[PDB]
Amino acid sequence: QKIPVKVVTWDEIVSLSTKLAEKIKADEYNVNVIVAIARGGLVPARLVADVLGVFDILSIKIEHWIETASHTPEAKVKYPFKVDLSDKNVLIIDDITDTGDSIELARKYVMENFRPTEVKTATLQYIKPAAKIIPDYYAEEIVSWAWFMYPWNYWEDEINLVNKILIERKTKDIDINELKRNFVESYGIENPPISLDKILTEMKRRKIV
Amino acid sequence: QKIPVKVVTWDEIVSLSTKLAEKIKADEYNVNVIVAIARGGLVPARLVADVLGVFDILSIKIEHWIETASHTPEAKVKYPFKVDLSDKNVLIIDDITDTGDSIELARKYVMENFRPTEVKTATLQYIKPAAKIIPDYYAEEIVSWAWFMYPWNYWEDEINLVNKILIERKTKDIDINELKRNFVESYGIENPPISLDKILTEMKRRKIV
Secondary structure (H helix, E strand, C coil), rough: CCCCCCCCHHHHHHHHHHHHHHHHHHHHHCCCCHHHEEEECHHHHHHHHHCCCCEEEEEEEEEEEEEECCCCHHHHHCCCCCCCCCCCCEEEEEEEEEECHHHHHHHHHHHHHHCCCEEEEEEEEEECCCCCCCCCCEEEECCCCEECCCCCCCHHHHHHHHHHHHHHHHHCCCCCHHHHHHHHHHHHHCCCCCHHHHHHHHHCCCCCC | CCCCEEEEEHHHHHHHHHHHHHHHHCCCCCCEEEEEEECCCCCHHHHHHHHCCCCEEHHHEEEEEEECCCCCEEEECCCCCCCCCCCEEEEEEEEEECHHHHHHHHHHHHHHHCCEEEEEEEEEEEEECCCCCCCCEEEEECCCCCEEEEEHHHHHHHHHHHHHHHHHHHCCCCCCHHHHHHHHHHCCCCCCCCCCCHHHHHHHHCCCC
């Protein structure tokens, strides 16, 4: 029914990214290479590279799997590969961390497969509740758990949010004005970044409806 | 002394990215994997993935080299590696193309090293003048050659633009208020995204001055 949803703007992304970079400047960690976790860490990685002056950005695709019956969570590196990053200080970046599985995994992967001089980890945001393993750097500690909608996820996030509504309410003949109401009601968003008509058009194109 | 400089905002990036994606929707190219050319294509790749619903994003670091005496230009893949992308339709993305060397190179590299089912190329912008090889997809053809300052390059671009000023001004020491004037004068920007004092502080940190 109701989900806590914060729409993050580009400006906030800039603020958070800049704040994260500034912590790294202050700690005097000399980053040679940034490894972005795809897809979440791509944008933050690029912005942080701009502020710090990093030229070498790489990325690793990380999948998140759940086992149906046991509800066991497993993160996995898709399209694994290796390169020689020895003599380098590596910074690993992702958008947001909770259980810390992704960054834990990426850190491990990077140590064994790229063998850098040193690895550190960073995210724009970290949720302290779910926090299992905690990132070396972060822009902002989240206290109030929420669903953060990032500007590089507006489409995907709105699609899923609209699907949760379509599934619960058993809507057959979708009404746009009805949807906007359900949306404002479940999520608190009266003006979604992508207009909900575009979202439906695209859900159709994708054979979701 | 004077350079044509357009400051690109986040909103414009969104427009261009969305417009590019829409051409791909319209052409009904079924993208399985996006390969972003680092560093330029990372942000566009992620936004395009959101609009199209691509989950698999990889990236390749491309360097640009010039031979001092001959002034010969050469793009090169740094930290090369391979993965198996067979049975996939790949889309290669970069921010902007002119001579088309990077996309030419990446296309080649991807064909030989990832061996996808098919490859196509895309950029936000393409300069028709310099255009040697032209991208399969693009948001916008540039007619008036300019220096486009993307939001993920605000620091790096301002640093270089300020350096061009410090160099012609044979000293490299300079007064903040004369810098702002030189900047407005050479480039037409009265309010740079990053304030020019921050830029000097960082040029120092970087031992550029």
